[PDB]
Ligand binder design. Sequence first.
Ligand SMILES: O=C(NC[C@@H]1O[C@H](CO)[C@H](O)[C@H](n2cc(-c3cc(F)c(F)c(F)c3)nn2)[C@H]1O)c1ccc(F)c2ccccc12
Ligand SMILES: [Cl-]
Ligand SMILES: [Cl-]
Ligand SMILES: [Cl-]
Length: 138
Amino acid sequence: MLIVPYNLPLPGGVVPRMLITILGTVKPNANRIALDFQRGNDVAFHFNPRFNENNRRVIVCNTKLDNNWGREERQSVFPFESGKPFKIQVLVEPDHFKVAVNDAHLLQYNHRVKKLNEISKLGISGDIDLTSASYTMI
Ligand SMILES: O=C(NC[C@@H]1O[C@H](CO)[C@H](O)[C@H](n2cc(-c3cc(F)c(F)c(F)c3)nn2)[C@H]1O)c1ccc(F)c2ccccc12
Ligand SMILES: [Cl-]
Ligand SMILES: [Cl-]
Ligand SMILES: [Cl-]
């Protein structure tokens, strides 16, 4: 019910206490999903489930500055399943983005991009049916 890739404007950027909620369903034969919190052409926070990286499922997080990817942060907890509905919650906290999937804490990602108020778009892409994408202040 939303078209992927989908752009969600974040007006005035992000700020601590801002909660972003993404609902959708992973496609049957999924390979990849990405959420990109963007500051212009930079990617402040890339959140990238890979369903088949050398026959392993991994989430890769990173930042893109001046077209260059930095040091990846990985982990092995992988809550997504092909064919199944998911909820991703991204809570902006003072020193990191905090991600929970299906109401279970997954990971945190320390802020590398410091101008939070310039992180003004969220891109959602890859092998999903996207139901909804929104934000609220908690
Ligand atoms: O391409 C690999 N790595 C290089 C780069 O790593 C970055 C993070 O450090 C971004 O994820 C880069 N990236 C990812 C995307 C992307 C685009 C989309 F439209 C999506 F829907 C999506 F989910 C992801 N765009 N840029 C990626 O190309 C990669 C290397 C070795 C392996 F073995 C891989 C196995 C499966 C998938 C990817 C690989
Ligand atoms: Cl910055
Ligand atoms: Cl700021
Ligand atoms: Cl896409």
